[PDB]
Amino acid sequence: GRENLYFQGLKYMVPGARVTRGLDWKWRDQDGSPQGEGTVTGELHNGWIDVTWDAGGSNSYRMGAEGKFDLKLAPGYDP
Numbered sequence: 001g002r003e004n005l006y007f008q009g010l011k012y013m014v015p016g017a018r019v020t021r022g023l024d025w026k027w028r029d030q031d032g033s034p035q036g037e038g039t040v041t042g043e044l045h046n047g048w049i050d051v052t053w054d055a056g057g058s059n060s061y062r063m064g065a066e067g068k069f070d071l072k073l074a075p076g077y078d079p
Contacts, residue, residue, distance in 0.1 A: 009063035012073060013040055013049040022072035032057055037074045
């Protein structure tokens with residue numbers, strides 16, 4: 001039994017969080033390298049979260065918006 005994905009989004013999508021793409025990703029190669037990782041840079045806004053990728057691009061991803069979760073916490077990141 002776990003908190004739903006919206007609750008997880010609220011708990012984990014905070015500045016500094018390390019992420020990769022996740023289940024609902026539909027954003028082509030924006031993660032910048034295969035299996036690329038990134039850092040969340042802000043707070044949730046209308047269910048979207050900002051990420052700066054290690055490859056260097058900055059953009060926004062759904063983590064609740066549209067009922068979709070585009071990211072996953074990166075391997076080795078355990079807050």
